[PDB]
Amino acid sequence: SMAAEDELQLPRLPELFETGRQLLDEVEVATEPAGSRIVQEKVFKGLDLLEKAAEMLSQLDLFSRNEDLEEIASTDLKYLLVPAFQGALTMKQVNPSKRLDHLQRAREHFINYLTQCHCYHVAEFELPSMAYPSLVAQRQAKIQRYKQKKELEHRLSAMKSAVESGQADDERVREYYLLHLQRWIDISLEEIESIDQEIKILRER
């Protein structure tokens, strides 16, 4: 029994990350209904995988809070995305009895993502409050944010193949991962706004 444990080889970090990423991607374009067993099972598996990645990362301490972004290796850059993916997947759960729980859990994931990106100066932005509600009183920001996202997504679409198929220099590789991080900063910001509105509604009930 101690033997059987030594001998078992579980998935490592890169697999855990890559699989959880595939799963999120799948759920995001699922042509099946959102709250179907087919989709919900992928969400559950994804959260589990990422939860395991997150723990691996904690133990490895890849990212400190007093570090410069150049000090992080190119291939480690992606791992910064884990909390943001966790937020995304958490939102994809359907279970109305526990919706308020999911929002608070998701909010926390996104704050974690944003908080890290902010220490590492990935982009200039205002970090939302740690706890609902993040006061915001305004539409322009969204138009600007929309145009930004369209432009990031386009640049990304031009580089994805090159990177994934190993035909990109290090400079290119890092620029690509930078672009993901920024894209996900925008997404997280936007989701926190969305979450705060949904909590306000759910609470008042």
Binding site: P33, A34, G35, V94, P96, R99, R139, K142, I143, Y146, K147, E190, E193, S194, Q197, E198, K200, I201, E204, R205
Partner: protein
């Protein structure tokens, strides 16, 4: 060729909801327009004393998923051709619950809530 809208609008007038995928697709088309610069829930307005068509939203005060869905689909098909007016929006418990009853979940409500943040 935007006949796709015609089908949606036709379907909405019979008071049949659209699907999440369609509701999502609709909001994005709108967002796309927004970020740059014929007869039917809604009620007809004639003008008087000395162009475009006029429409009033709701009965008097108090909105259904199909209503606001139609609102969006209309303005996307017709632009300035149809002016739409109310008195003096996505953020009501009754509307959230209505989305939640008519769909697996809260996504549709998010799509609209997001979209109306552009108005």
């Amino acid at each position: 060729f935007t006949k796709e809208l015609d089908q949606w609008i036709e379907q909405l007038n019979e008071c049949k909801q659209l699907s999440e995928s369609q509701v999502k697709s609709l909001c994005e088309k709108a967002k796309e327009i927004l970020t740059k610069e014929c007869g039917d829930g809604q009620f007809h307005d004639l003008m008087e004393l000395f162009d475009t068509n006029y429409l009033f939203m709701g009965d008097y005060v108090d909105y259904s998923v199909e209503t606001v869905t139609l609102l969006v689909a209309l303005k996307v098909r017709y632009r300035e051709r149809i002016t739409i007016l109310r008195g003096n929006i996505t953020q009501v418990y009754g509307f959230y619950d209505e989305c939640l009853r008519k769909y697996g979940n809260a996504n549709v409500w998010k799509y609209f809530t997001d979209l109306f943040d552009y108005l």
